[PDB]
């Protein structure tokens, strides 16, 4: 049962790992789209200045 404990623990740690990496990848995607919108906004801003 202790082996089951370590197994479930390491398993939850694994899903936590995949969840963190996935959500981080999601941050990167949002940062990308935000970078593009920020770029077009920089077009309007540079033209403004």
């Amino acid at each position: 049962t202790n082996s089951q404990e370590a197994a479930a623990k390491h398993e939850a740690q694994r899903l936590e790992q995949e969840a963190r990496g996935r959500l981080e990848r999601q941050k990167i995607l949002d940062q990308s789209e935000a970078e593009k919108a920020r770029k077009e906004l920089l077009e309007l801003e540079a033209m403004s200045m």
Binding site: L42, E45, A46
Partner: protein, 49 residues
């Protein structure tokens, strides 16, 4: 890139604008200055003659 090129383009075109207005303005003002010096040196040359 778009930001820095944008601001630099703005300041540079500003200098181009000032250079252009200074240009044509220098042309017209130099022309009126030309007529002024002309009539002045003309009457001066007459009375001095």
């Amino acid at each position: 890139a778009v930001e820095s090129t944008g601001n630099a383009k703005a300041e540079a075109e500003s200098r181009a604008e000032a250079a252009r207005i200074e240009g044509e303005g220098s042309v017209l003002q130099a022309k009126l200055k030309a007529q002024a010096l002309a009539i002045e040196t003309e009457a001066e040359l007459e009375r001095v003659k």
